[PDB]
Write a protein that binds this ligand. Structure first.
Ligand SMILES: Cc1ncc(COP(=O)(O)O)c(/C=N/[C@@H](COP(=O)(O)O)C(=O)O)c1O
Length: 382
């Protein structure tokens, strides 16, 4: 019989490396987890279960339990949408909406958009890694210390709100070309903001962040390499697409999305593909020469999408093409999705047009809201 996982989460602080995901994939493939003779002597297996989304764990002799029995499918949300705190709302106010699009794509590819602007701090996907990283920091690092990172915009905004709800000071480093909401809103949120107008990308800032961290002794949370990014997406974003697709009665044939740290799509793909390895992952390549906010080309360096055993496909997409998918989704659905969203929609549309895709439902992860990108919106129209 079962035990609340929340008493066992010291395994987050102690387990290392990716060998535990084997456990994660077999539990997802089989549909069950075998009973832990000693729960504390299998800290890997407990971490596989956290990661996939269990609220409970099987303890003692023999009895294997299903995914449902472990809490993967438990409803977190209160019917009435009342929450005692903004962090309780982040955590229990899930899943984000999965919304079937009116947008018509060729060869029977049915589009569902998963709306990641429904996260309360940055109105973006990047609330999830920021809550998980700052949560895990909270055991080891003293309140009032400074946490910092490089961002395209969204993670710093999230990092800033979250560090503050956990009693930490925050500093965010942006490239000059970053959107204005990423430069301004950390400050509103009580953080320090450094902008480098020469730094042509956001990863080019990391050597400075790392140098500064050495001198000034702040905590570089480094979303690019920190496994609590991938983990936050595994138990939120990915588990959600699984549970929603099942519970929605979807013929889930694939996922489409976009790549910054690679956290969210790495998890989406790895998770779902543990369940059914034929589920496709369609991934945006920002066409060379172009900048699509928040995202980049794979070969500029992304951890999880290269180290984990994930099957994916790329589809190159230009800024112009992305903003064109933003316009189309707006006129089809009345939903105003941001640039990286419309790149993912487009990449899905490119592959369906090629006849590569098995007819059925595909879930596009929409990282944020287009209200944050008016300049780009205005250029797309003129
Ligand atoms: C609008 C938007 N779309 C997609 C992504 C990609 O999510 P990830 O791959 O899980 O980081 C992000 C992630 N942004 C992160 C990472 O940015 P970066 O990898 O430097 O281009 C940030 O805000 O610093 C985003 O802001």
């Amino acid at each position: 019989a079962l035990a609340d996982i929340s008493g066992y989460l010291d395994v987050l602080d102690s387990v290392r490396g990716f060998s535990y995901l084997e456990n994660a994939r077999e539990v997802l493939r089989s549909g069950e987890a075998r009973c832990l003779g000693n729960p504390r002597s299998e800290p890997e297996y407990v971490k596989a279960l956290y990661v996939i989304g269990a609220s409970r764990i099987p303890v003692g002799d023999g009895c294997s339990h299903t995914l449902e029995e472990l809490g993967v499918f438990d409803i977190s949300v209160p019917g009435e949408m009342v929450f005692p705190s903004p962090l309780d709302f982040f955590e229990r106010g899930k899943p984000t909406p999965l919304v079937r699009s009116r947008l018509q794509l060729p060869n029977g590819v049915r589009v569902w958009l998963k709306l990641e602007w429904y996260n309360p701090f940055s109105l973006s996907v990047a609330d999830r890694p920021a809550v998980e990283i700052i949560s895990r920091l909270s055991r080891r690092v003293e309140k009032g210390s400074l946490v910092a990172d490089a961002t395209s915009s969204n993670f710093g905004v999230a990092l800033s709100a979250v560090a503050r709800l956990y009693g930490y000071r925050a500093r965010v480093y942006l490239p000059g070309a970053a959107e204005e909401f990423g430069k301004l809103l950390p400050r509103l949120l009580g953080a320090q903001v450094i902008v480098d107008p020469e730094a042509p990308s956001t990863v080019h800032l990391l050597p400075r962040v790392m140098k500064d961290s050495k001198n000034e002794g702040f905590v570089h949370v480094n979303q690019y390499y920190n496994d609590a990014n991938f983990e936050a997406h595994m138990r939120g974003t990915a588990r959600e697409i699984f549970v929603q697709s099942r519970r929605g009665g979807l013929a889930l044939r694939g996922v489409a999305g976009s790549l910054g740290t690679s956290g969210h799509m790495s998890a989406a793909a790895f998770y779902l593909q543990s369940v059914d390895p034929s589920i496709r992952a369609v991934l945006v390549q920002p066409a060379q020469g172009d900048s699509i906010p928040g995202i980049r080309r794979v070969e500029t360096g992304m951890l999880w999408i290269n180290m984990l055993d994930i099957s994916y496909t790329l589809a190159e997409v230009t800024l112009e093409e992305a903003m064109e998918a933003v316009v189309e989704v707006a006129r089809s659905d009345g939903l105003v999705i941001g640039p990286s969203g419309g790149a993912a929609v487009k990449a899905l549309a490119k592959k369906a047009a090629e006849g590569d895709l098995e007819p059925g439902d595909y879930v596009v992860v929409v990282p944020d809201t287009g209200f944050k990108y008016l300049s780009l919106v205005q250029n797309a129209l003129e």
